[PDB]
Amino acid sequence: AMFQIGKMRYVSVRDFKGKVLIDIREYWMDPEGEMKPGRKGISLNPEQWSQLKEQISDIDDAVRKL
Amino acid sequence: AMFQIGKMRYVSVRDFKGKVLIDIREYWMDPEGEMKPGRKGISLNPEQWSQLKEQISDIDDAVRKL
Numbered sequence: 001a002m003f004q005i006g007k008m009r010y011v012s013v014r015d016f017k018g019k020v021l022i023d024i025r026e027y028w029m030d031p032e033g034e035m036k037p038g039r040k041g042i043s044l045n046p047e048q049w050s051q052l053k054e055q056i057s058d059i060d061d062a063v064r065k066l
Numbered sequence: 067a068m069f070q071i072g073k074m075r076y077v078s079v080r081d082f083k084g085k086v087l088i089d090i091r092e093y094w095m096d097p098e099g100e101m102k103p104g105r106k107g108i109s110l111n112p113e114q115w116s117q118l119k120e121q122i123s124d125i126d127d128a129v130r131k132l
Contacts, residue, residue, distance in 0.1 A: 003121045003124060005118045006111075006114040013128035022129060039105070041106070043106075044075075048071045049129070051070070051071035056119065059079060062067060063079055
């Protein structure tokens with residue numbers, strides 16, 4: 001299901017049309033209090049997700065240099 | 067700089083308006099072969115990024131059982 005990374009921001013793991021997706025995304029809250037996906041986000045497949053993970057060290061380095 | 071996680075997909079680390087952004091995003095290629103940012107992406111601040119990292123194990127567990 002869902003993994004929160006900020007107010008109104010979630011990583012979601014779902015099966016969509018047979019295929020697994022790691023989705024990093026902004027959400028709105030509707031009037032019934034339900035979270036609904038906003039248009040600012042990205043769906044990654046597991047290989048892309050893997051590549052992201054593999055580069056965390058490099059990403060962190062760049063972030064630290066600021 | 068930039069970090070590739072698939073065809074047409076890059077994580078970008080930049081300083082924007084005083085603050086650091088880890089930006090995970092889809093790119094188009096223009097006719098001169100240059101990559102340009104598409105609208106499907108998300109800019110994460112370091113706190114959000116931290117929360118993402120903290121939950122990698124849990125995200126992976128979700129993905130694995132699928």
